[PDB]
Design a protein around this ligand. Structure first.
Ligand code: HEC
Length: 104
């Protein structure tokens, strides 16, 4: 739940493909601002896969905990090529950071 540690994980693991700031660029992956409490596939201006659109979950602490352990198990056919993060506490820290930064 540690936002300082989660920021560092974001930078190392995610930041090459994602921005989190309001109005931030889409890059390889979508800008993530506003995601908490949204369905998948909601960022206008981004080309998602049908797999992502068809997942039909709401993004939130628990769903992101599962997704980020193993993205392709959670959303088969996703084009996010990221193997996932093993440690539950590392995912928890990252998600706390995302919950701060994507709501800012
Ligand atoms: C490129 C190598 C990426 C890295 C590293 C990470 N992500 Fe990603 N993400 C990427 C793409 C190309 C996509 C679109 C996938 C699709 O099938 O359309 C995504 C998607 C996400 C999502 C879902 C976004 C939404 O539904 O609106 C999330 C929540 C997400 N990515 C988060 C995320 C995090 C936290 C990362 C670090 C652990 C991370 N991704 C790495 C590309 C890439």
């Amino acid at each position: 739940g540690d936002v300082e540690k989660g920021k560092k994980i974001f930078i190392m693991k995610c930041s090459q493909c994602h921005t989190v700031e309001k109005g931030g660029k889409h890059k390889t992956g979508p800008n993530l601002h506003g995601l908490f409490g949204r369905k998948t596939s909601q960022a206008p201006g981004y080309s998602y896969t049908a797999a992502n659109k068809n997942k039909g979950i709401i993004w939130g602490e628990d769903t992101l905990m599962e997704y980020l352990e193993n993205p392709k198990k959670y959303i088969p056919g996703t084009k996010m090529i990221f193997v996932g993060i093993k440690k539950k506490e590392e995912r928890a820290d990252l998600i706390a950071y995302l919950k701060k930064a994507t709501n800012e």
